[PDB]
Amino acid sequence: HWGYGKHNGPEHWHKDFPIAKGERQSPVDIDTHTAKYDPSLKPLSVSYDQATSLRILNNGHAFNVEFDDSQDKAVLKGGPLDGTYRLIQFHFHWGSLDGQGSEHTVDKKKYAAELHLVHWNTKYGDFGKAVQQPDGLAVLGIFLKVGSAKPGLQKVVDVLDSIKTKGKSADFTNFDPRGLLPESLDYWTYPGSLTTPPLLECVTWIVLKEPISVSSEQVLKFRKLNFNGEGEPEELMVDNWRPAQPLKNRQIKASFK
Numbered sequence: 001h002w003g004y005g006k007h008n009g010p011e012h013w014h015k016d017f018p019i020a021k022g023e024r025q026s027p028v029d030i031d032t033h034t035a036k037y038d039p040s041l042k043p044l045s046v047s048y049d050q051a052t053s054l055r056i057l058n059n060g061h062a063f064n065v066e067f068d069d070s071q072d073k074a075v076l077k078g079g080p081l082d083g084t085y086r087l088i089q090f091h092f093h094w095g096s097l098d099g100q101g102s103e104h105t106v107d108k109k110k111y112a113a114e115l116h117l118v119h120w121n122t123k124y125g126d127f128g129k130a131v132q133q134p135d136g137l138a139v140l141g142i143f144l145k146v147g148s149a150k151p152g153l154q155k156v157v158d159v160l161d162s163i164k165t166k167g168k169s170a171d172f173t174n175f176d177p178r179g180l181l182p183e184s185l186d187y188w189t190y191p192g193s194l195t196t197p198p199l200l201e202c203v204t205w206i207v208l209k210e211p212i213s214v215s216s217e218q219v220l221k222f223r224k225l226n227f228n229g230e231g232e233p234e235e236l237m238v239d240n241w242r243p244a245q246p247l248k249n250r251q252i253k254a255s256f257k
């Protein structure tokens, strides 16, 4: 099954998921000089005040913090988006070392990690129907650099010891995802895909320009997670990122002049 190792990682995925070589795959390198300000973008609205987190799960690839998406609570609107997109989960991708870990790159520079807040377009009723649509999903991507600690991340860090291995989950109620955002909502946007199998080309990507800072100790705890299940040989959950894919017939737009 797919993973991030030498024998099942990104360079193998196309054999089961031929869309891996498709026309709008993610992530991509963001060439900041070629990205163009787009005056047609509307103001972006990240409305997370009523978010209801439920659970945190080690799925063998990353950990997902899951939300109640049975009503409009935490939603993303505006910017490049037509209509309302509901938060379903967030997760991260990270490296074995601070010099790698992000999926998107900025002028080829790799960040230590990248946070993905995943939302589905409510016009399609459910996530499963949304991933049959070209505009089914919106992912808000946020880079992580290592420096000062991110206070709003610490509750996540501290629960990871309870979900060390694949298939473990824990209650994770009353978590406020607003604490994971940077100050500025300046962003780049482009049409792309899921960055893990099934690699579906459903995503409007919104990648914030300003990274968040997390401490070395915080990211080191990400790196203590395991890809394997309980009782199996330990394989540290590190380097769970897909490298940049060809831009092909796309343009990256900037929200800022």
Ligand SMILES: OC[C@H]1O[C@@H](O)[C@H](O)[C@@H](O)[C@@H]1O
Pocket: 036, 251
């Ligand atoms: O034809 C001109 C147009 O070319 C497009 O590729 C750009 O996205 C537009 O911003 C520009 O106005």
Ligand SMILES: OC[C@H]1O[C@H](O)[C@H](O)[C@@H](O)[C@@H]1O
Pocket: 155, 159, 171, 172, 173, 174, 175, 176
């Ligand atoms: O907010 C997420 C979680 O943070 C801490 O783990 C709290 O102890 C727990 O009650 C809460 O579910």
Ligand SMILES: NS(=O)(=O)c1ccccc1
Pocket: 001, 002, 003, 007, 008, 009, 012, 013, 014, 015, 016, 017
């Ligand atoms: N796509 S996958 O599951 O990573 C895969 C790996 C090796 C051979 C065929 C498929």
Ligand SMILES: NS(=O)(=O)c1ccccc1
Pocket: 116, 118, 139, 193, 194, 195, 196, 197
């Ligand atoms: N990593 S990603 O593109 O945010 C993603 C989101 C949901 C499912 C699969 C992948």
Ligand SMILES: [Zn+2]
Pocket: 091, 092, 093, 116, 195
């Ligand atoms: Zn992701």
